[PDB]
Design a protein around this ligand. Structure first.
Ligand SMILES: Nc1nc2c(ncn2[C@@H]2O[C@H](COP(=O)(O)O[C@H]3[C@@H](O)[C@H](n4ccc(=O)[nH]c4=O)O[C@@H]3CO)[C@H]3CC(O)(O)C[C@H]32)c(=O)[nH]1
Ligand SMILES: [Cl-]
Ligand SMILES: [Cl-]
Length: 397
């Protein structure tokens, strides 16, 4: 009857034209904030609505988009990572955004650069996250431990707090996103002379750091659920996690949650965070009329108020300069120093490779190498040499 998705269903039933938007939000603040945006957009249109359709998580979404093509029936819009855009571009499946008439002046260059392919923009940055350092303010105060500003300090702090609390206080998922933080901040790069390399010396160093942290009793692998679904079980000091975790950490944490910029190589600058979350793309297969709904919706999404409300509700990074000048954004940042912390971290941002095969590689090849080393004590170099060979085989295929 009156939940936001019930209201959207009633709005789309009355509408002349309905543009489907397929997404990967399972719940929480992200799902609610997307639905609230859509309700507001749909109220403003005479008979021209967006229908958000949850597809599960992001990988369920791309699988379903792939099947939708094979079935010949794609949605008007979807969320897509840069790797998903690369893949959909092989099938010529995406409309250039600037062709549609969406104005992109004032979108963060970081974000716009990531959705530009052969000099053409194919996505609108929508829900873009950055990794931040979550921490337990209470536990650091209890032992006199400053928030670590360098990787050296962070390791030292994890050791000191783990010894004091009798268990590993740095919590991590053994996955490609957590690996990227350590890899990037040890000077790693995935592309060497245009070739994807998973077994570089910095990759080996990064994976060895995490495996040694598990051995030394300062790093705790989280194998079942998000870190924020594991809090309460054992002492927690720190995690490196997406800024879109923010609402889930806040609800779960039974301690005073802190958010900091990432530890870097030196105090000269924060460490680089991995940019995650998604862009909205518009499919060529849409009708001209559905495409016109997409154009109005994308201009609404990029309006400063819509950005301000969406970002402060979720911990995503506002994608426009105008969002930071909007009073609703300003009011929230003044009350909550974590929004500002998330925006400052967004200045020190790195992306994974924008390759069609990258989604498969990050989970099934690279993520599996990281799990072998962390959970089964595989030799880090042996595990990443295996990854490198599977990735080369997949790309050459
Ligand atoms: N398919 C595919 N996924 C990719 C790719 N690159 C990265 N990722 C995944 O992006 C997630 C980050 O995206 P983000 O929007 O920042 O965060 C998500 C959720 O992670 C996070 N969440 C949800 C529930 C919860 O209890 N806690 C919480 O933090 O909230 C958001 C909305 O669901 C990572 C997580 C991952 O899914 O394990 C693997 C990573 C790619 O190329 N393809
Ligand atoms: Cl003590
Ligand atoms: Cl790189």
């Amino acid at each position: 009857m009156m939940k936001p998705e019930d209201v959207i269903k009633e709005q789309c039933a009355r509408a002349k034209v309905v543009a489907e938007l397929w997404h990967g939000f399972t719940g929480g603040a992200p799902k609610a904030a997307l639905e609230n945006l859509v309700v507001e957009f749909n109220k403003a249109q005479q008979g021209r609505c967006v229908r958000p359709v949850p597809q599960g998580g992001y990988r369920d979404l791309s699988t379903k988009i792939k099947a939708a093509f094979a079935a010949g029936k794609v949605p008007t819009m979807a969320q897509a990572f840069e790797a998903n855009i690369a893949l959909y571009l092989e099938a010529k499946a995406l409309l250039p955004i600037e062709s549609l008439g969406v104005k992109l002046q004032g979108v963060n260059l970081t974000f716009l650069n990531a959705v530009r392919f052969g000099g053409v923009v194919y996505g609108v940055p929508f829900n873009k996250s950055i990794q931040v350092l979550y921490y337990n303010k209470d536990l650091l105060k209890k032992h006199g431990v400053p928030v670590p500003a360098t990787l050296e300090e962070f390791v030292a702090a994890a050791k000191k707090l783990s010894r004091a609390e009798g268990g590993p206080v740095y919590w991590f998922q053994p996955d490609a996103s957590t690996f990227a933080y350590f890899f990037f901040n040890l000077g790693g790069s995935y592309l060497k002379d245009g070739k994807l390399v998973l077994n570089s010396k910095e990759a080996v160093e990064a994976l060895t750091l995490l495996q040694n942290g598990v051995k030394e009793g300062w790093a705790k692998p989280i194998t079942s659920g998000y870190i924020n679904q594991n809090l309460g079980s054992g002492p927690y000091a720190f995690s490196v996690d997406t800024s879109a975790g923010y609402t889930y950490y806040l609800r779960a944490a039974k301690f005073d949650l802190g958010v900091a910029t990432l530890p870097g190589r030196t105090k000269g600058q924060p460490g680089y965070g991995l940019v995650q979350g998604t862009n909205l793309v518009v499919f060529r297969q849409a009708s001209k009329e559905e495409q016109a709904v997409a154009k109005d919706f994308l201009e609404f999404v990029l309006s400063p108020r819509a950005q301000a409300v969406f970002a402060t509700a979720t911990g995503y990074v506002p994608v426009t300069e105008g969002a930071l000048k909007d009073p609703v954004y300003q009011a929230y940042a003044a009350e909550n120093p974590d929004y500002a912390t998330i925006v400052r971290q967004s200045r020190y941002a790195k992306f994974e490779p924008a390759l069609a095969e990258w989604e498969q590689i990050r989970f099934d090849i690279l993520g599996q190498a990281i799990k072998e080393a962390i959970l089964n004590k595989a030799d880090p170099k042996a595990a990443l040499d295996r990854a490198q060979k599977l990735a080369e085989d997949l790309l050459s295929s």
